[PDB]
A paper describes a structure:
[name], and this interaction targets [name] to centrioles. allows homo-multimerisation, the interaction with the PB3 domain of [name], or both. structures and interactions of CCDs and [name]-PB3s in humans and flies. [name]/Ana2, which can then interact with and recruit Sas-6.
Author numbering:
A (entry chain A), B (entry chain A): 2 to 3, 726 to 750
Amino acid sequence: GSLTEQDRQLRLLQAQIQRLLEAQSLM
Amino acid sequence: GSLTEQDRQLRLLQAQIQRLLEAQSLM
């Protein structure tokens, strides 16, 4: 539960949102 | 942009949200 880990998982979340939106032709 | 791909990226998004929330001690 470190900030190191939270920060990593948040950035990976941001990437994965983008990946979905690109697959949807929205980004 | 297939549904195959959207469905995959959506499920990966769901997993990654969960991963963040577990790192945050919220799940």
